[PDB]
């Protein structure tokens, strides 16, 4: 019984961690965009349309 419970809970934890990894990657992409926008659009004037 204990083994079966361990397996189930372990699978749940695996799923959660993987979901977190993917979401963190997307957030990092957005943060890189924000940094680029701030550097090229506040510290100077940009000529890139829209």
């Amino acid at each position: 019984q204990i083994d079966r419970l361990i397996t189930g809970r372990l699978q749940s934890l695996q799923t959660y961690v993987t979901q977190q990894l993917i979401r963190a990657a997307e957030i990092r992409a957005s943060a890189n965009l924000a940094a680029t926008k701030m550097s090229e659009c506040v510290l100077g004037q940009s000529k890139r349309v829209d």
């Binding site: 699978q11 749940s12 799923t15």
Partner: protein
């Protein structure tokens, strides 16, 4: 179409719920992608004859 199997599956919890949620997220992100790429013009212009 197996009631006993559904009863067994109920014991695992919310695994299938997480999966449906994720696939719906992807399915809406796709339409977000196409609108962002194409819907950049406010009006519909037309070339003269």
């Amino acid at each position: 179409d197996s009631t006993e199997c559904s009863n067994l599956l109920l014991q695992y919890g919310s695994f299938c719920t997480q999966l449906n949620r994720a696939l719906t997220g992807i399915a809406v992100e796709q339409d977000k992608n196409t609108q962002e790429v194409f819907a950049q013009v406010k009006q519909i212009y037309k070339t003269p004859p």
